[PDB]
């Protein structure tokens, strides 16, 4: 009966880039989800499974938190089927989500004097990201007939690219840390009650 | 607002630190391509001083300047090609007449 | 293709990944046997300008093209390429440039 570690998951100082978000397994403890729901912080909460404010009693096998930061406006592709580059080529939701989704601005932690290039997420790639799947290569992706053999150039792009997040963008184009809770059942015992 | 290159086809063997000068008066961002006979050319030098995701050959990427006598001293493995200068003011964003390395 | 003296230019390149702040689309002849000459570069917000030269290029990130344009093609004969400048430091992502191919001829 020790409380689950989200003060590790939400209160984390480095969140993960989306292209390679962290991946948190949460079990053998019990998770308290007041202090999560009415937190007043957050500015997105949305629940695609068991609804907010009565999990706080339901009990899982598994709850996997899954931090990264993504901006304002792609905050609404963290949705079980959705499209754009953030669902498509980084991070896919399934159609059968059960889950939480958890977003809070972070102007004040993640935009630098010049703006914090520090945050990638994957432009290009051939096929969109099977859900859960989590593509880390650094390839070079290709847009043409000519074979890339590895060297950068033209029809040869980078696939990743870097948000340029800063204190003076518009509210979409704010970071916005993002902390996705996915929970299982399995035929196993439940280990995650409140 | 020329970007003169000295050398005038400098060469005289392989394995050997080939310094090429681009006299060009200029602010900073003077950029370094190198051309292959019947090929693209490619970035080398895009700041003056650093070194573009490349240049696995001799990785020799030289830069010494901005009191614009600028050179680029390098080794010569295999890498037998052309080298070009250009400027970054926007106006007149020019090429340098380069020189060739046989 | 071998474009007559006076019919309009026209040249097309693929171009993927929006304008990100940084981002050039440049033109570069380069007449045969000579040195290496520039035509335009497209900044990522929309700044355009040119050479001496009455060119009418212009990039569009969406549909994927960029194109280059121009009014009279007296004589010029060179070879044309698409580049793409990055000519902001991005974090991980270094300034770059990356060339294409392609010619025109006259008569
Ligand atoms: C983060 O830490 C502060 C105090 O250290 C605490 O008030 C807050 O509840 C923590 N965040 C979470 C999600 O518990």
Redesign the interface.
């Known amino acids: 009966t020790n409380l689950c570690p989200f003060g590790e998951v939400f209160n984390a100082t480095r969140f993960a880039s989306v292209y390679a978000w962290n991946r948190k397994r949460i079990s053998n403890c019990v998770a308290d989800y007041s202090v999560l729901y009415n937190s007043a912080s957050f500015s997105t909460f949305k629940c695609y499974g068991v609804s907010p404010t009565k999990l706080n009693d339901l009990c899982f096998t598994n709850v996997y938190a899954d931090s990264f930061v993504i901006r304002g406006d792609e905050v609404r592709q963290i949705a079980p089927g959705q499209t754009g580059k953030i669902a498509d080529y980084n991070y896919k939701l399934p159609d059968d989500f059960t889950g939480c989704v958890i977003a809070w601005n972070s102007n004040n932690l993640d935009s630098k004097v010049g703006g914090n290039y520090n945050y990638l997420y994957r432009l290009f790639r051939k096929s969109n990201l099977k859900p859960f799947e989590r593509d880390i290569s650094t390839e070079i992706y290709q847009a043409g007939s000519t074979p890339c053999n590895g060297v950068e150039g033209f029809n040869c792009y980078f696939p990743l690219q870097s948000y340029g997040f800063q204190p003076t963008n518009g509210v979409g184009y704010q970071p916005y840390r993002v902390v996705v809770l996915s929970f299982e059942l399995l035929h196993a015992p439940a280990t995650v009650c409140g | 607002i020329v970007l003169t290159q000295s050398p005038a086809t400098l060469s005289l063997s392989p394995g050997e630190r080939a310094t090429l000068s681009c006299r060009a008066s200029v602010s900073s961002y003077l950029a370094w391509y190198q051309q292959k006979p019947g090929q693209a050319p490619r970035l080398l030098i895009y700041d003056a001083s650093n070194r573009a995701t490349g240049i696995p050959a001799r990785f020799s990427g030289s830069g010494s300047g901005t009191d614009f006598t600028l050179t680029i001293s390098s080794l010569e493995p295999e890498d037998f090609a052309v080298y070009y200068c250009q400027q970054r003011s926007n106006w007149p964003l020019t090429f340098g007449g380069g020189t060739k390395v046989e | 293709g071998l474009l007559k003296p006076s019919e309009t230019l026209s040249l097309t390149?693929?171009v993927?990944?929006?304008s990100?702040?940084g981002y050039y689309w440049?033109w570069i002849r380069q007449p045969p046997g000579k040195?290496?000459?520039?035509i335009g570069?497209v900044n990522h917000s929309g700044s355009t300008?040119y050479?001496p030269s009455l060119k009418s290029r212009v990039t569009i990130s969406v549909d994927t093209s960029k194109n280059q344009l121009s009014l009279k093609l007296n004589s010029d004969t060179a070879v044309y390429?698409?580049a793409?400048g990055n000519?902001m430091?991005?974090?991980?992502?270094?300034?770059?440039?990356?060339?294409?191919?392609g010619t025109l001829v006259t008569v």
């Open positions: 390149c693929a993927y990944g929006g990100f702040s440049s040195g290496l000459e520039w570069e300008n050479n390429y698409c793409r000519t430091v991005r974090g991980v992502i270094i300034p770059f440039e990356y060339w294409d191919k």
